[PDB]
Amino acid sequence: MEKLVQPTPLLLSLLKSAGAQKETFTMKEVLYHLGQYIMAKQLYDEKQQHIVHCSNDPLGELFGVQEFSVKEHRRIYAMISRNLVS
Ligand SMILES: COc1ccc(C2=N[C@@H](c3ccc(Cl)cc3)[C@@H](c3ccc(Cl)cc3)N2C(=O)N2CCNC(=O)C2)c(OC(C)C)c1
DSSP: OOOOBOBOHHHHHHHHHTTOOOSOBOHHHHHHHHHHHHHHHTOBOSSSTTEEEOTTSTHHHHHTOSEEETTOHHHHHHHHHTTBOO
8 A cells, every 4th residue: 555645735736736636645646746747837957857947936945945856766755755744
């Protein structure tokens, strides 16, 4: 089985803008919708497309960074865990 987690308000709002419909998700579902948000907002770098630019988007406040690479899975997981109801 997989644990169902509960995104805090800001993260949840970004997930729902990407199409998410519920309030609890597996981590796989959180990541998927977050990736969809990034694609929709065109936050990825044009030239190195694994790089995500947050400096001009609310995602930047949420995570607390300016850029991250989708290769940094531990960093991304950490940023998400900071934004779950404990
Ligand atoms: C070569 O370009 C790529 C390569 C891989 C990813 C990626 N890889 C996936 C991923 C990344 C990190 C983790 Cl921890 C798990 C899965 C997933 C994802 C999930 C969460 C976040 Cl915050 C960002 C991306 N994520 C994506 O969402 N992708 C993958 C392919 N299909 C998509 O719809 C876009 C990618 O994401 C963009 C949105 C930047 C771009």
